[PDB]
Amino acid sequence: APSTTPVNEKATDAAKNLLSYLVEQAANGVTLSGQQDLESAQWVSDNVGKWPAILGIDFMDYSPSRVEYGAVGSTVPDAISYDSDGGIVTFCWHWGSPSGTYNTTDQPWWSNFYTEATAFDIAAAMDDPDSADYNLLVRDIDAISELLLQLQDLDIPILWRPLHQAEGGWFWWGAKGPEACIALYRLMFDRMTNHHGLNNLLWVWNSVDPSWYPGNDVVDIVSADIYADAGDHSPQEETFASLQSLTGDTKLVALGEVGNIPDPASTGGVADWAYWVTWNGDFIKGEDYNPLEYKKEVFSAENIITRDEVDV
Ligand SMILES: OC[C@H]1O[C@H](OC[C@H]2O[C@@H](O[C@H]3[C@H](O)[C@H](O)[C@@H](O)O[C@@H]3CO[C@H]3O[C@H](CO)[C@H](O)[C@H](O)[C@H]3O)[C@@H](O)[C@@H](O)[C@@H]2O[C@@H]2O[C@H](CO)[C@@H](O)[C@H](O)[C@@H]2O)[C@H](O)[C@@H](O)[C@H]1O
Ligand SMILES: *[C@@H]1O[C@H](CO)[C@@H](O)[C@H](O)[C@H]1NC(C)=O
Ligand SMILES: [Cl-]
């Protein structure tokens, strides 16, 4: 069954308490609501009637290579505000490649997390710790670690989901097979936990295939991102079962991203997702994926937690 002990023995009380709360809720057939982007969370409050429990945001535009092209990151204040309002925060990282950005017509700099938008080679970087690219990877990790340390100084625990969707291959970190991506994940875990003393993090992995798994010693929560056909609100039992066997059923299981919110009237005892995070834009705002009447039902449900109900 899911562990309530963070893999970082030095975890803060706020990180320990968040993991224990999520495990308890999921064991009871309760799922936390979530939404990517503060403006979309505001839309849900304004149109559906509830603030999502979890705010998903991204370190993307703090990536050092993106700063070189004029990017201005602004999500750390949104984490602080959501936490001040009683919510929970998850970060992903659409990591702009440390070198190799093309910045062409078809591959603008602002797409430089996609494999197609950069020359960057994660495998060549990880095989040579003396290389410029290896040193730039560690510098990028240090850049994002500073942001996480600001959040740790404020006693804000974070559901940290780096190197997401890795196995798909469409982001540069997944373009050179599993070994290089696992090595980068474990390097990040060590650099953040040990060198930086980051103790406010719960580590969320986001690939299903066992050959991509970085190990139970460096992961607190396993997840997948599901973009089913518009209007498919099934519980996604097969994916849930694959995420249980990934860890020998020792880690909490969640949805990192959804296009379609799984119907909470059909998940109980089939696929006890700890949380889901709806993507931004049309996925939450339109009528094709998650219609207004359905959203109102989901967010009002007894077995869905919204921000007003969070009680860590
Ligand atoms: O490539 C065409 C694209 O145009 C518009 O999006 C542009 C926007 O795309 C960002 O990547 C998205 C991606 O489009 C898709 O929604 C999904 O894969 O997510 C990624 C990453 O999302 C991240 O950014 C958004 C806000 O854009 C949000 O905060 C989310 O939380 C975060 O995870 C990304 O490439 C952006 O850079 C890009 O916008 C550009 O942004 C830069 C500054 O970052 C500006 O300088 C630039 O002018 C432009 O706005 C459509 O929205 C999309 O549908 C697709 O058509
Ligand atoms: C990226 O490409 C655009 C479009 O050609 C160009 O105007 C811009 O100066 C480039 N950015 C950098 C920092 O070279
Ligand atoms: Cl503490």
Numbering used by the authors: 1 to 312
Give the original sentences from the paper that presented this experimental model.
The structure of the deglycosylated YpenMan26A acid/base substituted variant E165Q, in complex with a α-62-61-di-galactosyl-mannotriose (MGG), was solved by molecular replacement using the known structure of PansMan26A24 as template, and refined at 1.36 Å resolution. The YpenMan26A chain can be traced from Ala1 to Val312 without breaks, and forms a (β/α)8-barrel fold as expected. The active site was identified in the groove with the conserved catalytic residue Glu165 (acid/base) mutated to Gln, and the conserved catalytic residue Glu257 (nucleophile), equivalent to those observed in PansMan26A24. Crystals of YpenMan26A E165Q were obtained in the presence of α-64-63-di-galactosyl-mannopentaose (MGGMM) with the aim that the oligosaccharide would span the catalytic site. However, the electron density of the ligand was modelled as MGG situated in the −4 to −2 subsites. Since YpenMan26A E165Q was not completely inactive, it is likely that the residual activity has caused hydrolysis of the MGGMM between the backbone monomers in the −1 and +1 subsites, after which MGG migrated to span the subsite −4 to −2, indicating high ligand affinity in these subsites. The electron density of MGG is clear and unambiguous, except for the galactopyranosyl unit in the −3 subsite, which points out of the binding cleft. There is electron density present near the mutated Q165, which is remote from the ligand, and was described as acetate, which fits the density well. There is a single N-glycosylation site at Asn103, located on the external side of the barrel, with a residual N-acetylglucosamine (GlcNac). Previously, enzyme interactions with a galactopyranosyl substituent attached to a mannopyranosyl unit within the −1 subsite of CjapMan26C have been described. Interestingly, because of the captured ligand in the present study, it is possible to identify interactions between the galactopyranose unit and the YpenMan26A in the −2 subsite not previously described.
